[PDB]
Amino acid sequence: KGFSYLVTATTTVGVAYAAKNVVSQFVSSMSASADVLAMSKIEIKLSDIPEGKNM
Amino acid sequence: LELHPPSYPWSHRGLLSSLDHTSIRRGFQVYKQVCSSCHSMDYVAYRHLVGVCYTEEEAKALAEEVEVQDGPNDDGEMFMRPGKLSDYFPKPYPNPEAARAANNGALPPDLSYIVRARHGGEDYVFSLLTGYCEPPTGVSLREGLYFNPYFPGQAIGMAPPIYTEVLEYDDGTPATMSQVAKDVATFLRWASEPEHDHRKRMGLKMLLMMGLLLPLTYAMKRHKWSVLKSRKLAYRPP
Amino acid sequence: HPLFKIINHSFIDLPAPSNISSWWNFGSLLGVCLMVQIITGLFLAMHYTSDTMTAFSSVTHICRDVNYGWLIRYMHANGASMFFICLFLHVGRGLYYGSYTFMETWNIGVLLLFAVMATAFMGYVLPWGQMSFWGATVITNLLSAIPYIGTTLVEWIWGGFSVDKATLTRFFAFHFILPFIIAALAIVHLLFLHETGSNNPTGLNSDADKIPFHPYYTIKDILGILIMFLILMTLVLFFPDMLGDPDNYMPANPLNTPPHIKPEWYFLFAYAILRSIPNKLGGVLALILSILILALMPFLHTSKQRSLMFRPITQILYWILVANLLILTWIGGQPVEHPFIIIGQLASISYFSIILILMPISGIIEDKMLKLY
Amino acid sequence: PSRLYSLLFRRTSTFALTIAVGALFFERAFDQGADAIYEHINEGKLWK
Amino acid sequence: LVDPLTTVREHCEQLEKCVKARERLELCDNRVSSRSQTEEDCTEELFDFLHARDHCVAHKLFKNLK
Amino acid sequence: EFGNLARIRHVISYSLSPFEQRAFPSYFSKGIPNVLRRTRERILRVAPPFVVVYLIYTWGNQEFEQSKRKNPAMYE
Numbered sequence: 045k046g047f048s049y050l051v052t053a054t055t056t057v058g059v060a061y062a063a064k065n066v067v068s069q070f071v072s073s074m075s076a077s078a079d080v081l082a083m084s085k086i087e088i089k090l091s092d093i094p095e096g097k098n099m
Numbered sequence: 100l101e102l103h104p105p106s107y108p109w110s111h112r113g114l115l116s117s118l119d120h121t122s123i124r125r126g127f128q129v130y131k132q133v134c135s136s137c138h139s140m141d142y143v144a145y146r147h148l149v150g151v152c153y154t155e156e157e158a159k160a161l162a163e164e165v166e167v168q169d170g171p172n173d174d175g176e177m178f179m180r181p182g183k184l185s186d187y188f189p190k191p192y193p194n195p196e197a198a199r200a201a202n203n204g205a206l207p208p209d210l211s212y213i214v215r216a217r218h219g220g221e222d223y224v225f226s227l228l229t230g231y232c233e234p235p236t237g238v239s240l241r242e243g244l245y246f247n248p249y250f251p252g253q254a255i256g257m258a259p260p261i262y263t264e265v266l267e268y269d270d271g272t273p274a275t276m277s278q279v280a281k282d283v284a285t286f287l288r289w290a291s292e293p294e295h296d297h298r299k300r301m302g303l304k305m306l307l308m309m310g311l312l313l314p315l316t317y318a319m320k321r322h323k324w325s326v327l328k329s330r331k332l333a334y335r336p337p
Numbered sequence: 338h339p340l341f342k343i344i345n346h347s348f349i350d351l352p353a354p355s356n357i358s359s360w361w362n363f364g365s366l367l368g369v370c371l372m373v374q375i376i377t378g379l380f381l382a383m384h385y386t387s388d389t390m391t392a393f394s395s396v397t398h399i400c401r402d403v404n405y406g407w408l409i410r411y412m413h414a415n416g417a418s419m420f421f422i423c424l425f426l427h428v429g430r431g432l433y434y435g436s437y438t439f440m441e442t443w444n445i446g447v448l449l450l451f452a453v454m455a456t457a458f459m460g461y462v463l464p465w466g467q468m469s470f471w472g473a474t475v476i477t478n479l480l481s482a483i484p485y486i487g488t489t490l491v492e493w494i495w496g497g498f499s500v501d502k503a504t505l506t507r508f509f510a511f512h513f514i515l516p517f518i519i520a521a522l523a524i525v526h527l528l529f530l531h532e533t534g535s536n537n538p539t540g541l542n543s544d545a546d547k548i549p550f551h552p553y554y555t556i557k558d559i560l561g562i563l564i565m566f567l568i569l570m571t572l573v574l575f576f577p578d579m580l581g582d583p584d585n586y587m588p589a590n591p592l593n594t595p596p597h598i599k600p601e602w603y604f605l606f607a608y609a610i611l612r613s614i615p616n617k618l619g620g621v622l623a624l625i626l627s628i629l630i631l632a633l634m635p636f637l638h639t640s641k642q643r644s645l646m647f648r649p650i651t652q653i654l655y656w657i658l659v660a661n662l663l664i665l666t667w668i669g670g671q672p673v674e675h676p677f678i679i680i681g682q683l684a685s686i687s688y689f690s691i692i693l694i695l696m697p698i699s700g701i702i703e704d705k706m707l708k709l710y
Numbered sequence: 711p712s713r714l715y716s717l718l719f720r721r722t723s724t725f726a727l728t729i730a731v732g733a734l735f736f737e738r739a740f741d742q743g744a745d746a747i748y749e750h751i752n753e754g755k756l757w758k
Numbered sequence: 759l760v761d762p763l764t765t766v767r768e769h770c771e772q773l774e775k776c777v778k779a780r781e782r783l784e785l786c787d788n789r790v791s792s793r794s795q796t797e798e799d800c801t802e803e804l805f806d807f808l809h810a811r812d813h814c815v816a817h818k819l820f821k822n823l824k
Numbered sequence: 825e826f827g828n829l830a831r832i833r834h835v836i837s838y839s840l841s842p843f844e845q846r847a848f849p850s851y852f853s854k855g856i857p858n859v860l861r862r863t864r865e866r867i868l869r870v871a872p873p874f875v876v877v878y879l880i881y882t883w884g885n886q887e888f889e890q891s892k893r894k895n896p897a898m899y900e
């Protein structure tokens with residue numbers, strides 16, 4: 045029985061490994077892509093904002 | 100009727116052979132110094148390089164190398180900013196017409212997906228760039244043309260752009276016409292498929308996982324199906 | 338439990354024939370492929386934009402910056418190719434083993450085949466490449482065949498004088514909505530079959546030898562799913578562009594036309610037939626009949642044996658039919674010039690004569706050999 | 711080994727538990743191994 | 759700077775099979791030129807020679823290149 | 825459903841437990857002979873249509889090439 049149950053456990057793990065990965069890839073797809081990921085850039089000019097004005 | 104470019108033993112051709120990534124570096128240099136005057140790699144942005152053949156800060160350098168003016172300005176209709184990592188490669192001849200104007204009315208096709216868009220692209224590219232041989236007898240190309248046995252019709256407006264030692268490779272690898280055509284074919288290839296390397300790693304993991312999982316699932320099926328495959332039927336009329 | 342009643346009965350204890358070969362896996366594979374296509378299609382729809390302005394780019398962005406987006410796009414394309422491979426083998430199983438005598442199941446099948454071909458055509462139009470635009474125009478204009486009803490109808494689908502944004506957007510809507518109708522038609526397909534049960538390769542009444550489905554034809558379907566996944570991935574991750582066309586990687590230029598234009602592999606057999614008939618209308622009709630001849634198939638069965646396991650002459654005619662189907666697939670690819678044309682004309686004549694004439698006459702002869710006729 | 715069956719497979723939950731743990735570790739090994747194999751395969755042609 | 763290609767094309771042409779082909783083409787060339795009122799060109803002839811030369815180069819160019 | 829599928833009589837049916845039987849008994853022992861047995865019984869019905877498809881395909885290709893070949897008498 046062990047040998048047989050062994051085979052299945054092994055097969056199970058295999059499917060699991062691939063499963064986790066593909067799903068992860070897909071969920072990763074929905075995750076912000078690099079296109080929007082790059083947004084650190086910011087440009088500012090102090091003179092434009094006088095005391096008491098929000099920008 | 101067209102010459103069919105031969106098969107070259109491209110390194111990346113191997114099932115698990117990733118793109119050199121060292122060569123590409125050279126190839127781009129070739130695009131930046133020669134091919135960018137007429138062709139537009141519209142779908143490749145400086146950021147794309149990071150991770151392939153140029154490091155983050157390194158890419159930043161190149162990005163800044165060129166200048167990019169964006170119209171939105173508070174009062175101005177533009178503001179010029181040295182290219183940022185996000186900026187896409189600078190296309191010349193903003194309107195295609197510009198290109199046609201100067202290119203004898205021949206639009207330099209974006210070389211972004213040229214390798215993917217041309218049948219047997221990598222080969223074609225190499226062949227075309229290196230196929231600038233002598234026109235034969237009886238041929239009468241129109242004004243502003245050149246002779247390449249591969250190009251459809253053998254009449255490509257593009258003049259031969261790679262003269263031996265056209266540009267100097269920063270790596271110092273001799274800049275022979277060929278060494279330059281092979282590098283730009285690798286680069287254009289990379290351009291048309293930035294994921295070539297990542298994929299092949301996924302394919303290797305897929306082959307290992309299927310080689311593990313197919314005999315095990317076959318063994319489970321043959322377990323459950325052994326019962327029947329051993330069933331012995333006997334007819335015993337009374 | 339009401340649901341479990343439906344479940345166990347339909348998916349677990351469905352008395353199935355014990356001797357059905359691996360070919361009977363293929364239909365289940367088709368269902369899996371449908372789900373795979375739908376899932377991949379949904380993850381293409383979160384970033385694709387039907388605007389002719391951003392289509393090419395939308396797709397480029399899909400294969401360039403969308404995380405693993407190249408993986409989902411090429412899985413979608415090669416899964417459409419895998420869908421048509423499994424569809425052709427499913428139809429070939431139905432033709433070989435006499436499964437067309439389940440007439441309602443066969444007719445719901447040929448409706449599903451028409452819907453899948455329309456879905457794949459509009460999906461191939463969707464990336465808005467050079468090849469997509471000229472392909473759309475071409476067989477859309479095919480619809481321009483009908484004399485009084487055709488012309489207007491074409492521009493109606495084109496939504497304008499010529500395919501342009503108007504088309505792309507409605508083709509996106511129709512390509513989105515038809516696989517759910519395909520899923521509903523597949524549910525009707527499964528129903529019209531359980532009323533009669535599946536057939537076996539011997540073609541005999543398998544009521545004396547039926548086994549459950551859960552432990553016997555489930556692990557078999559799981560193994561077939563694993564093998565089909567091996568072939569798809571190894572056709573995406575290693576040979577991703579094998580089944581596609583290079584000219585689809587150029588943007589759609591209405592001013593230029595790809596010099597060598599061809600339908601994708603699966604639609605070629607039809608393409609050949611269309612090209613073969615000189616008359617435009619004739620071509621369109623023959624083309625349709627090409628698919629429809631199948632529906633007509635259950636009325637052409639003149640044999641007293643259901644399957645071709647014990648019928649060697651009709652086996653020879655069947656493999657000649659598969660042979661010239663492969664020939665018509667090749668011809669479609671070849672350009673218009675001698676002698677590709679003649680082969681196309683013959684191959685089409687031989688295809689229609691084998692399905693219409695030669696197989697019932699051969700079945701009559703086979704019944705005469707067994708002292709039955 | 712009977713021990714395996716008696717301890718790990720006998721209880722269905724353990725059967726799952728072992729699978730679960732195995733899965734948790736398989737990824738690590740397979741990933742790293744395949745990565746290196748790949749790395750070795752393309753030993754020189756990479757970004758480095 | 760000797761482009762490996764240059765050298766390879768030399769060896770490849772030196773291949774006899776290829777040699778014979780070139781001859782054929784030249785005949786065509788002169789024939790075409792000699793013929794006064796004609797339009798036939800040696801392009802097809804040129805094409806055939808190339809296929810062979812290129813194939814040969816294919817076998818020995820990549821390695822030569824670095 | 826099961827129980828009302830068919831009527832058989834006096835057909836005894838013996839079987840064994842999966843774990844009591846080897847997984848691929850004589851697999852390659854008889855598998856090869858059988859696969860070969862099978863291929864014989866079907867090769868003459870299957871193969872010659874695809875053989876003449878190969879001949880027609882090659883023929884077409886070569887014929888097409890010759891067709892593309894320039895008439896010697898052309899333009900002379």
Ligand code: HEC
Pocket residue numbers: 129130133134136137138202203205206207208210213217224227228250251254255256257258260261280283
């Ligand atoms: C200074 C000008 C110039 C340079 C340098 C140049 N090109 Fe071009 N190229 C053109 C023009 C003009 C066309 C349009 C020709 C046509 O469409 O017939 C063109 C068209 C092409 C085409 C389209 C061929 C086809 O199949 O339709 C390819 C491929 C191409 N170039 C590759 C390159 C490569 C590869 C390089 C360098 C590694 C390069 N070009 C450098 C001007 C240039």
Ligand code: HEM
Pocket residue numbers: 371374375376377378379381382385396410413414417420453454456457460461462463464512513514516517581
């Ligand atoms: C409802 C489920 C589906 C959705 C949401 C969907 C969505 C899409 C989208 C957005 C595209 C454009 C991507 C692109 O081509 O670049 C596309 C392309 C495509 N779809 Fe679908 N699709 C679905 C089901 C199907 C099915 C069932 C088939 C097969 C019959 C199919 C075949 C195709 C094909 C062939 C393409 C073009 C691939 C290419 O670019 O060459 N799709 N799909």
Ligand code: HEM
Pocket residue numbers: 360361362363364365367368371424427428431436437439442443445446447449450453523526527530534535536537631
């Ligand atoms: C993609 C669309 C289709 C799907 C998803 C589908 C699915 C299925 C499924 C799941 C079965 C159950 C038996 C089996 O799979 O072996 C089946 C049976 C059948 N299908 Fe299809 N089918 C499709 C298209 C067709 C077409 C186009 C035809 C006709 C050419 C057809 C003819 C049949 C027949 C005759 C059967 C009964 C075969 C038997 O069980 O013995 N199907 N189909």
